Amino acid sequence: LPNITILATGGTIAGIANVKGEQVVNIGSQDMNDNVWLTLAKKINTDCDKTDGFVITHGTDTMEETAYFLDLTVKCDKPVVMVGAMRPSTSMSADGPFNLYNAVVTAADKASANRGVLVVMNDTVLDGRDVTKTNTTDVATFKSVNYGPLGYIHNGKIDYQRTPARHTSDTPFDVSKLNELPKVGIVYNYANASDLPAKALVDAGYDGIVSAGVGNGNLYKSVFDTLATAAKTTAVVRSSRVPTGATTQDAEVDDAKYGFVASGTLNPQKARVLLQLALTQTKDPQQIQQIFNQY
Amino acid sequence: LPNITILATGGTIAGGGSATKSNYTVGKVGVENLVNAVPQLKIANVGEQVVNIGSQDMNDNVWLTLAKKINTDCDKTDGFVITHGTDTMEETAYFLDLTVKCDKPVVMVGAMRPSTSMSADGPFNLYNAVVTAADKASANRGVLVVMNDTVLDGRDVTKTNTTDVATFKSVNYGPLGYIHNGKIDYQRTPARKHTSDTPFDVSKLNELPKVGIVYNYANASDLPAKALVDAGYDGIVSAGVGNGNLYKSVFDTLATAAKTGTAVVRSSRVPTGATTQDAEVDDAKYGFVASGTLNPQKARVLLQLALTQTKDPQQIQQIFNQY
Amino acid sequence: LPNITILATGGTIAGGNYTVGKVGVENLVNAVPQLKDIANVKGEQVVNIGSQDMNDNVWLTLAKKINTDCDKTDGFVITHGTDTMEETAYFLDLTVKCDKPVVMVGAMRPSTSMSADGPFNLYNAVVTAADKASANRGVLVVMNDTVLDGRDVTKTNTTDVATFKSVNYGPLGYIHNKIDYQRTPARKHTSDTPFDVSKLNELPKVGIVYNYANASDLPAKALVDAGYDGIVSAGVGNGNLYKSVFDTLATAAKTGTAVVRSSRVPTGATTQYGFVASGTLNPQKARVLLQLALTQTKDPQQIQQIFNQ
Amino acid sequence: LPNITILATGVNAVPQLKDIANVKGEQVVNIGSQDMNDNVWLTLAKKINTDCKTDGFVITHGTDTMEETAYFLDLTVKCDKPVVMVGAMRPSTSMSADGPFNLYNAVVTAADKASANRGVLVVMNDTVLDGRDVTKTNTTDVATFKSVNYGPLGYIHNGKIDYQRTPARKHTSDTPFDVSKLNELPKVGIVYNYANASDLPAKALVDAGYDGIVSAGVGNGNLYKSVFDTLATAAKTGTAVVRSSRVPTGATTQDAEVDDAKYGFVASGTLNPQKARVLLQLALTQTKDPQQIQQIFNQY
Numbered sequence A: 001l002p003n004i005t006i007l008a009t010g011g012t013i014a015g016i017a018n019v020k021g022e023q024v025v026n027i028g029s030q031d032m033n034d035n036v037w038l039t040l041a042k043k044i045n046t047d048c049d050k051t052d053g054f055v056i057t058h059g060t061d062t063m064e065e066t067a068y069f070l071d072l073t074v075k076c077d078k079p080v081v082m083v084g085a086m087r088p089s090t091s092m093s094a095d096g097p098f099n100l101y102n103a104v105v106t107a108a109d110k111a112s113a114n115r116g117v118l119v120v121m122n123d124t125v126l127d128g129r130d131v132t133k134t135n136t137t138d139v140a141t142f143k144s145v146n147y148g149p150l151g152y153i154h155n156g157k158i159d160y161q162r163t164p165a166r167h168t169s170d171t172p173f174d175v176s177k178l179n180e181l182p183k184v185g186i187v188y189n190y191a192n193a194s195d196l197p198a199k200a201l202v203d204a205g206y207d208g209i210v211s212a213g214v215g216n217g218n219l220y221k222s223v224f225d226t227l228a229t230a231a232k233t234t235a236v237v238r239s240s241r242v243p244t245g246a247t248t249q250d251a252e253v254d255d256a257k258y259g260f261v262a263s264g265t266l267n268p269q270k271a272r273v274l275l276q277l278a279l280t281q282t283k284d285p286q287q288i289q290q291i292f293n294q295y
Numbered sequence B: 001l002p003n004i005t006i007l008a009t010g011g012t013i014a015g016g017g018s019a020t021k022s023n024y025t026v027g028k029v030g031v032e033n034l035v036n037a038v039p040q041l042k043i044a045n046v047g048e049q050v051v052n053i054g055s056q057d058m059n060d061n062v063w064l065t066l067a068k069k070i071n072t073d074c075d076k077t078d079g080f081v082i083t084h085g086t087d088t089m090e091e092t093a094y095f096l097d098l099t100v101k102c103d104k105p106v107v108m109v110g111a112m113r114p115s116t117s118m119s120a121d122g123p124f125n126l127y128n129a130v131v132t133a134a135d136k137a138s139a140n141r142g143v144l145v146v147m148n149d150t151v152l153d154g155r156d157v158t159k160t161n162t163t164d165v166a167t168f169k170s171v172n173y174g175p176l177g178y179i180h181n182g183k184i185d186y187q188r189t190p191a192r193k194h195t196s197d198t199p200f201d202v203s204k205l206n207e208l209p210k211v212g213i214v215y216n217y218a219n220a221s222d223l224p225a226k227a228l229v230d231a232g233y234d235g236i237v238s239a240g241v242g243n244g245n246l247y248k249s250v251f252d253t254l255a256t257a258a259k260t261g262t263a264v265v266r267s268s269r270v271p272t273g274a275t276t277q278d279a280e281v282d283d284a285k286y287g288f289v290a291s292g293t294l295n296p297q298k299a300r301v302l303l304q305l306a307l308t309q310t311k312d313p314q315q316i317q318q319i320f321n322q323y
Numbered sequence C: 001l002p003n004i005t006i007l008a009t010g011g012t013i014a015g016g017n018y019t020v021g022k023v024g025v026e027n028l029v030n031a032v033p034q035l036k037d038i039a040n041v042k043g044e045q046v047v048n049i050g051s052q053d054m055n056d057n058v059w060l061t062l063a064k065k066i067n068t069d070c071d072k073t074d075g076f077v078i079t080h081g082t083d084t085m086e087e088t089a090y091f092l093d094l095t096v097k098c099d100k101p102v103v104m105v106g107a108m109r110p111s112t113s114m115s116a117d118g119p120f121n122l123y124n125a126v127v128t129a130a131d132k133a134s135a136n137r138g139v140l141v142v143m144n145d146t147v148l149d150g151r152d153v154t155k156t157n158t159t160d161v162a163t164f165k166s167v168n169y170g171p172l173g174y175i176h177n178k179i180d181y182q183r184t185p186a187r188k189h190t191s192d193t194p195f196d197v198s199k200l201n202e203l204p205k206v207g208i209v210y211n212y213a214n215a216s217d218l219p220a221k222a223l224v225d226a227g228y229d230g231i232v233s234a235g236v237g238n239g240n241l242y243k244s245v246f247d248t249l250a251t252a253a254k255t256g257t258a259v260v261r262s263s264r265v266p267t268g269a270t271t272q273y274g275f276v277a278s279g280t281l282n283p284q285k286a287r288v289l290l291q292l293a294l295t296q297t298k299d300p301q302q303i304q305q306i307f308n309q
Numbered sequence D: 001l002p003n004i005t006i007l008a009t010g011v012n013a014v015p016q017l018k019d020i021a022n023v024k025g026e027q028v029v030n031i032g033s034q035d036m037n038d039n040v041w042l043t044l045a046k047k048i049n050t051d052c053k054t055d056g057f058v059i060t061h062g063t064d065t066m067e068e069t070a071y072f073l074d075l076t077v078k079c080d081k082p083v084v085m086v087g088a089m090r091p092s093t094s095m096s097a098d099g100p101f102n103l104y105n106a107v108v109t110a111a112d113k114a115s116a117n118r119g120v121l122v123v124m125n126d127t128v129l130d131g132r133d134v135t136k137t138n139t140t141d142v143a144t145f146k147s148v149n150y151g152p153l154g155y156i157h158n159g160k161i162d163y164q165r166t167p168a169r170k171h172t173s174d175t176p177f178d179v180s181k182l183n184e185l186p187k188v189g190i191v192y193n194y195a196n197a198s199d200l201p202a203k204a205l206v207d208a209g210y211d212g213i214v215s216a217g218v219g220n221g222n223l224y225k226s227v228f229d230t231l232a233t234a235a236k237t238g239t240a241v242v243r244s245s246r247v248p249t250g251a252t253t254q255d256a257e258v259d260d261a262k263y264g265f266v267a268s269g270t271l272n273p274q275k276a277r278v279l280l281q282l283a284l285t286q287t288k289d290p291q292q293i294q295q296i297f298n299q300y
Ligand SMILES: N[C@@H](CC(=O)O)C(=O)O
Pocket: A215, A218, A252, B010, B011, B012, B013, B026, B027, B053, B054, B055, B056, B084, B085, B086, B087, B088, B110, B111, B112, B113
């Protein structure tokens, strides 16, 4: 049988294949940070040749952030499948066993390769870029809200009907010998939104700022002004607190005039992930925007 | 016919750009020109231009102006229709839902496409909004949002999509009724207290307590919360991850802010589902408030009003458990 | 503690590829020791079958049981198959004269499976059946942490444990650890209906015909040939019908048969022909209501008023 | 500009199309889409196949059965040029009639080459949808058409399409289905399952000797006992029987509660009843064997 290594990183999930298990760290994913991300990726890139595929048990809270980061830093072309649980393992009707079950299936399937980093939840294979946590409590919380799942799992078989075109081998981000990430913060937009948050990050000389805008990534006037001065003086990506849909160019915001970057379908967390890595290679908004159109 | 007062605030309903191209500005078209875009209203007898702005610049002053209109002119009309930007309609609609002391159907409506666009959605939406406002069965339902042929309540309505004309959805509890042929089959009503049942009286308020929102994500910086605390904000909402949790940095500063009096509400960046008590965070232990089903923008609204009557974390927790 | 009586009909929840309705009611209770902390659970095995074989006789039995024993218990939970629960639940919603909570629950995964969903479903069903806030909402279905109304709950997905959704108007409340009730159904239900099945041992014959391109009209004609009392059309779009099928139902309606227009399109109302528009009711739910109406009238005009209920 | 042929089945009104393409109109038929049928399909496919010349096609169609025509054309059109279907949920007389911008975007999609080699497409309310998974979800909503199982191929903004997906099942040029030489399609009907379901509708189709029957089963393609009894005898008389589901989302899978291979049934996978009918009709043009039909249903 193929050999699949389970990498455990935390999450309620604790709190066909020849399966080996290693625990890298054990944290709530709400405390997820650059160091675990750099450690997790360096682990998988180092042990790529040593196994047939990886399954990663993780907290569901920032699962979408980790999955996107690995989707952009994993150079291992072998399947990397992320998995978690919404109910505790000791609790009744614990969902984790069959989730992890399905993840090993996904990681064992030879058809799964070259689909990037995947997330497997509730009988479904989700792509790392579009997966998001939809609901605070549901076991079916994970969804690709914009483009949808890649496949469904039944009786150990996967009917793959999609593959993402936007990852893994094909990305230029190499964090192998990197021990820090650029600083990227996220500011929320709302009625009468305060600029205090964005002013705080700019004054700290943050490399980047993501805007959790309203609608098509729009900003409150105070915020927009301040981010306009920062971008023109800090990288600023426009994303949206809106859970679904692209933050587009050519709507109500001339980004060129302002040197903003429209985040596309990337939500504020995922936009942050991509902005962080883009700032390891360039700081020009005109250049970054090209990165955001391909990843 | 019923008398419906249309209060205009701006919005992509009142915005223009060419019909093809997608660049456009909002809070352009004056109300009077929107009335004319919908010849088929003489349903009701159409009005006032309060502001003409993109709803992304919506703020307490416009909120307070809106509430003061509706309550003072309640007896002079049969119901109101508020033309608004889609971006914060869920916020405005919730504030009015907590502050309007009238019964008249207060129905908010917007458009995802500019009025100059091809197949602009605003004319027929505004039609159904008037329809909604004119049907008195809409009375006693709180502040409503009528979008894409659907009637939604101000508490649960939220913007699901950045571009879809079907963008608005009551994701957690669902719509109140659907509109066909100028007729509404209402099958629900919201259970939380709204409008006339709220303990909030804005008649003598010209400004709201200061409440900001901090976002949560991996490795999150705590400088925004430290900035809001240092700024003496009355309330802070965290758009937490999952069931309202915080990154260690952010939880640290808010732990200290809450202990020295700041209202701290735990909500979720997660668009649907409740941020509940007794999960991973013991709210009674750090004097916090779980926001329940209220998303962060809506949680801000409730904490702002709550801070007009009380600064007790036990007391706020029930305001959030009741509205 | 409250007395909750569990009425079992089968389902995957009681099943063990897999077979439905193998396990008995005491074993669905056994499997969750925690129910001892919440209610005094008693059980009755009404039938033990896959809900794809659910039928009128079982419907009539359930309604009479719930109606007769309403004064013997504090609330009922019905363990049931997920395939037709949306029908049974809506049937009970209109025929139960009991005001006490009547809660339906099921499983998408067998009792034998990894991550079997029935235990926590059945627990949450008993909680709901025990909560005083649940009474007077009509018949409820509790699946995957949520209280759903019998009228609007429908099965949205073929395999998901979260399949059940009130797709048009949404859930009534959410269950965590004790229910956040924020909605209540406005159409009339339970003790508020004009339908009395107590002394009925058969129901009027109602069938369903599907519409699609090139649709054959032989299925509609077969139901016409059988003198079926009612025909629901699973139409396309907003209750539209293929030409040949529309012709046959025109003849069926003209010779006395009730014809309700519904839609195969899973969401939204089929709107208001001397036909009956089903409104938001999908074909199977439209079927149950049309069945009941034909116990009180066969007037299409009065039948449409029933559907506006 | 590319030459786009708009084939109408049910203009000067949108002048902004002419900013994107050189329109040819042509009235293939004049029908309500609830009356869509095999003959319009055979004509549509043969028309497109012969005129494949042009740079792309746009097909204006009623929304009610568009998902059937889209899938049928998805499997029988041999042209690799973009074939885009579009309709309106609101009449053109309405206040906010959606047809103009839909038609606009359909021409945009059809004129874009990135659209080629994605099969037959459906463009409705700002979205590029694949012919296989696209389905009509809501009775009146303008946002009704959506790919519920696997999702949209791209979104249209400002007359530009961000394609991020393509369907993996074989379509168009990779299919063995050639309707060019057919003047009729095999007779395949659909029966619904519900509690107490009557077997009279399915027996009517067996009595008329239909080649194929699709079951809109409950749950994972299950059948009421009466209907199963009937479909079993039909399979026993060489009839093809495909198990689908009235449930709008998810696959009707093998290895659940019905031993397909024992009875000779085919699980439809994610194909819903009307779509399963389209493929079974074409499947019956090449074979009448359940292993081969089931394979075909895992292939398309
Ligand atoms: N920025 C606009 C967007 C819209 O109206 O759709 C607003 O909310 O005012």
